């Protein structure tokens, strides 16, 4: 019942995000970093939602996993670490 807005989103490994809106119910999307791809079956959507008990709002944790681009795992072989 105020002008409730969400804090910065938490980091997602190998992903970045540019928030268009911090307002309640805002839907945003992480994007996998160059050479990484959204893992099939995982979602990059995050939503600003209301802890309706305490009146604070947070970004939902996306199911997103960014994995190395299989095009490059195969065609541009590389060490780990």
């Amino acid at each position: 019942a105020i002008s409730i807005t969400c804090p910065p989103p938490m980091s997602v490994e190998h992903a970045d995000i540019w928030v268009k809106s911090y307002s309640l119910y805002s839907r945003e999307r992480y994007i996998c970093n160059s050479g990484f791809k959204r893992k099939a079956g995982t979602s990059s959507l995050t939503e600003c939602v209301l802890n309706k008990a305490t009146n604070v709002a947070h970004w939902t944790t996306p199911s997103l996993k960014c994995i190395r681009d299989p095009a490059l795992v195969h065609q541009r072989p590389a060490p780990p670490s």
């Binding site: 099939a40 079956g41 979602s43 299989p70």
Partner: protein, 114 residues
């Protein structure tokens, strides 16, 4: 009762999901194999099934979820190999219309009953 491939019922669920999403604004791009090779149709089906779960998660809708759940159980009832196939993340990302059209295309390959 007569015997009819389970995949016929999968198409019926895809039609239902397409109708249900029409109201909503689901704007994920999803990995889409629009030209499945028969030698890789299990790999390709598996990708479609995975990405279908994204439509459900992003919808946050009971009926879409129920219909996705019903589809995936049918499909897994119809499955359980292949080599030289693309991984899902090598596939083009397409919008929900194109994704679902291609899903129908491959479900139709599996009615044969391939």
């Amino acid at each position: 009762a007569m015997a009819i491939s389970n995949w016929v019922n999968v198409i019926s669920d895809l039609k239902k999901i397409e109708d249900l999403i029409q109201s909503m604004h689901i704007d994920a791009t999803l990995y889409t194999e629009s030209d499945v090779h028969p030698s890789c149709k299990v790999t390709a089906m598996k990708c479609f099934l995975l990405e279908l779960q994204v439509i459900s998660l992003e919808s946050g809708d009971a009926s879409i979820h129920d219909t996705v759940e019903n589809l995936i159980i049918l499909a897994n009832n119809s499955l359980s190999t292949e080599s030289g196939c693309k991984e899902c993340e090598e596939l083009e990302e397409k919008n929900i219309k194109e994704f679902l059209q291609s899903f129908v295309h491959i479900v139709q390959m599996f009615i044969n009953t391939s």
